[PDB]
Amino acid sequence: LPPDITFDSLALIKMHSQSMKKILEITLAKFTVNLSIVTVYRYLTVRAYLKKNIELELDVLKDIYNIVPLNEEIAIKAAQIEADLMRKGMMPDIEDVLTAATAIYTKSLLITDDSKRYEPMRRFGLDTMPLDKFVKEVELMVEKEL
Amino acid sequence: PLPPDITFDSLALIKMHSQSMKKILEITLAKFTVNLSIVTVYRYLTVRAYLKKNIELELDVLKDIYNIVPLNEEIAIKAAQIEADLMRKGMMPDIEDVLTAATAIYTKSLLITDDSKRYEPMRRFGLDTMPLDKFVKEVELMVEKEL
Amino acid sequence: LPPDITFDSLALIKMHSQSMKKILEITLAKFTVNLSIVTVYRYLTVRAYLKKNIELELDVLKDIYNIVPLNEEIAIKAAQIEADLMRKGMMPDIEDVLTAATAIYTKSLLITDDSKRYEPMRRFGLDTMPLDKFVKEVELMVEKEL
Amino acid sequence: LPPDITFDSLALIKMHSQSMKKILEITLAKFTVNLSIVTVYRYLTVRAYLKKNIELELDVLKDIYNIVPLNEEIAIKAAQIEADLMRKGMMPDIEDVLTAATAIYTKSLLITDDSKRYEPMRRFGLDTMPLDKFVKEVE
């Protein structure tokens, strides 16, 4: 529903698949997509692995997406998230905490195929939504003439 | 005329900021340009927030004594290339290592660490390392000689 | 500010002038300089015209610079770039195409006094920076330090 | 006569044409052809302009020709050739200098459809022969 959304690495990959190509088209009509540089880096890693020109692929990425650098404000947030998770006896991935920190920072709804690993970070102001539910919401909006 | 460029990983940075390393830190700041990845900064402030310190306060001191290098598009490309090429060879490196290494190659910083063997697969990419113990002995030596 | 840079032949000429002696010295400690063998040959032409000792000078360039041969991989990129330019009605100079292709292949920022000359090649991934701006940035690091 | 030969860019194009298939056949059996990477890049350029896959095309050239990178030794000789030619009130093409410099180095008879523009470079050890005369002496 909100104007600002983001995706984590796997949801980004799904959103790029030929079968999402229509959902993507509507997504970019309707939402501002604020990707973490971590998500971009993880994505560019697998592209480069497939021997793609990642300098060119990044140019295409920044044409349709906002790419959010990892700065000092996000690092503060991520440290505080991680330390709290660690106090509660949990072992968060670095990629997750940094992706959540960036989403909290840009005030973006995080679209993910694995919502639950971000659940311990809800308490910090992260909104999340399952990819399959997000896909259903986008089609509904077209039906509702939004 | 320019002071050599160096960096630290987060384990080494934590030790550089210990009570016992105050003078070494002070000499290090006077004699070198220290280019810290924002990711090393984040991992360091994680330790500090776990100890319930004032991370905003301490980050402002860090901001002042360190060149803090954000993770931007250019370092991400470099890190993506590094990591893809390591994978093309059977290896699955840690995110912290790759982004740390990639930032040190991009800033041309000697990476100072207690775990130099962990960083060996990235030598080919132009990473230079030096063990913390050896770096500390060398800083001590420069002070001895000048004084 | 990136770690890998290069110069065209006219920029290299200036970099080795008397005025630029300290800048040159700072560049070599702060950066990796990846020079196309084409740039090197055009530089050596000027030097040979001034009745200098070009074999001796070359032996010094070899130790301070990464001199990049015109190999198969570069020849293919140069060819793709030039054909694409010709398809748009442009006739680029051989030295520009080969310089630009080598810099794309090496991922080096091309420092030059004639950035407009090279602008048709940015779409292929070429990064440039004016020599004046580069010099001033080097001088700034020195001023701040001293 | 010599086992070592090379072509410049136009000559290579004409050697690759339909009419020259037999001459090319006898050329590849009789001679070692030492092609400058510069000749190759120029050839690949006109193929890419016709939207050919030059990776595929480079692989064919790789198998039939000795492709000669532009290295430090060639660069010195080209610099010397060029500076000298300039002091004598000329401005040679860069492609021509690099092509001549590579032929001197590989001690290759340069086969060209334009021998005259290479004439200033004879004094540096370059051997040239017209393609027309070459074709005659092949058949």
Note whether C71 contacts D: Cβ–Cβ < 8 A: yes
CA distances from B30 to A102, C85, C141 (A): 34, 51, 15
Can you give A36-52 as a three-state secondary structure string?
A: EHHHHHHHHHHHHHCCC
- The structure tokens 């459809």 sit at D113
- Tell me which residue in A72, A78, A95 faces B68 most closely, judged by beta carbons: A72
Residue C34 to residue C28: CA distance in whole angstroms: 11
Query: Would you tell me how many other CB atoms lie within 10 Å of the CB of residue B64?
Result: 9
C-beta atoms of C3 and B105 within 8 A: yes
Query: Any idea what the Cα angle at residue A91 is, between residues A87 and A95, rounded to 5°?
Result: 120
Residue A82 to residue A95: CA distance in whole angstroms: 11
For chains A and D, having 3+ Cβ pairs within 8 Å is answered no
| One-character DSSP codes across D75-104 | HHHHHHHHHHHHHTT----HHHHHHHHHHH
- Tell me which residue in B2, B5, B106 faces C145 most closely, judged by beta carbons: B2
What are D68's two structure tokens?
């000669």
- Breaks, C-N > 2.5 A, in chain D lie after none
Residue C143 to residue B114: CA distance in whole angstroms: 34
C-beta atoms of D70 and C72 within 8 A: no
Note whether C133 contacts B: Cβ–Cβ < 8 A: no
> From the DSSP assignment, how many helices (H) and strands (E) are in chain D?
7, 5
Order of strands across the sheet that contains D109-112: D66-68, D32-36, D4-7, D109-112, D128-130
CB B4 within 8 A of CB B104: no
Q: What share of chain A is helix, strand, coil (3-state, %, to 5)?
A: 65, 15, 20
CA distances from B124 to B66, C49, C68 (A): 27, 39, 18
- Taking CA–CA distances from C127, the nearest residue in chain A reads A55
C-beta atoms of C26 and B105 within 8 A: no
CA neighbours closer than 13 Å in the CB half-sphere of residue A51: 1
CA distances from C78 to A4, C72, D101 (A): 42, 10, 21
Q: Which residues of A touch C2 (CB under 8 A)?
A: none
CA distances from C122 to A32, C3, C119, C126, D93 (A): 27, 19, 5, 4, 26
- The structure tokens 């697998």 sit at A46
Burial class (CB in 10 A: 0-12, 13-18, 19+), D56: exposed
Which of C13, C39, C45 would best serve as a mutation to test chain D binding (most D beta carbons within 10 A)? C45
Sign of CA dihedral B90, A67, A55, C65: negative
Tell me whether residue A84 is annotated as binding. Answer: no
Residue type, C107: K
C-beta atoms of A48 and B76 within 8 A: no
> Could you say which DSSP state residue D65 is in?
S
Domains, chain D, with CATH or none: 1-139 (3.40.50.1010)
CA distances from B72 to A68, A80, A82 (A): 8, 22, 22
Beta strands in D1-138 (DSSP E): 4-7, 32-36, 66-68, 109-112, 128-130
Number of Cβ pairs closer than 8 Å across A and B? 90
Residue B140 to residue B20: CA distance in whole angstroms: 13
Q: Which residues pair with A35 in a beta bridge?
A: A67
Residue B41 to residue A133: CA distance in whole angstroms: 36
> From the DSSP assignment, how many helices (H) and strands (E) are in chain C?
8, 5
A144: left (phi > 0), else alpha (psi -120 to 50), else beta? alpha
CB B114 within 8 A of CB B132: yes
Backbone angles phi, psi at D133, to 5 degrees: -70, -35
CB A81 within 8 A of CB A92: yes
CA of C70 vs chain D CAs: smallest distance (Å): 5
CA distances from B51 to B44, B138, C56 (A): 11, 31, 61
CA of B53 vs chain A CAs: smallest distance (Å): 10
CB C129 within 8 A of CB C27: no
Residue type, A140: L
Query: Would you tell me how many other CB atoms lie within 10 Å of the CB of residue A123?
Result: 11
Residue D131 to residue B8: CA distance in whole angstroms: 64
Note whether C125 contacts A: Cβ–Cβ < 8 A: yes
Query: Would you tell me how many other CB atoms lie within 10 Å of the CB of residue A113?
Result: 15
- The structure tokens 């090197």 sit at C40
Residue A129 to residue A138: CA distance in whole angstroms: 12
Partners of chain A (3+ Cβ pairs below 8 A)? B, C
What are B141's two structure tokens?
């030596």
CB B34 within 8 A of CB B28: yes
Note whether B41 contacts A: Cβ–Cβ < 8 A: yes
CA neighbours closer than 13 Å in the CB half-sphere of residue B5: 21
Burial class (CB in 10 A: 0-12, 13-18, 19+), A46: middle
Which experimental approach was used here?
X-ray
What are C126's two structure tokens?
């070429």
Tell me whether residue B9 is annotated as binding. Answer: yes
What are B73's two structure tokens?
């598009």
What are C9's two structure tokens?
């032949």
| A16: enclosing H helix or E strand | helix A9-16
What are A70's two structure tokens?
């990892």
- Taking CA–CA distances from B41, the nearest residue in chain A reads A75
CB C2 within 8 A of CB C33: no
Q: Which residues of C touch A56 (CB under 8 A)?
A: 125
- Taking CA–CA distances from C124, the nearest residue in chain A reads A56
Order of strands across the sheet that contains A32-36: A66-68, A32-36, A4-7, A109-112, A128-130
Can you give chain B as a three-state secondary structure string?
A: CCCCEEEECHHHHHHHCCHHHHHHHHHHHHHCEEEEEHHHHHHHHHHHHHCCCCHHHHHHHHHHHCEEECECHHHHHHHHHHHHHHHCCCCCCCHHHHHHHHHHHHHCCEEEECCHHHHHHHHHHCCCEEEHHHHHHHHHHHHHHHC
Note whether D124 contacts C: Cβ–Cβ < 8 A: no
Note whether C37 contacts D: Cβ–Cβ < 8 A: yes
The total number of residues written for chain C in this structure: 146
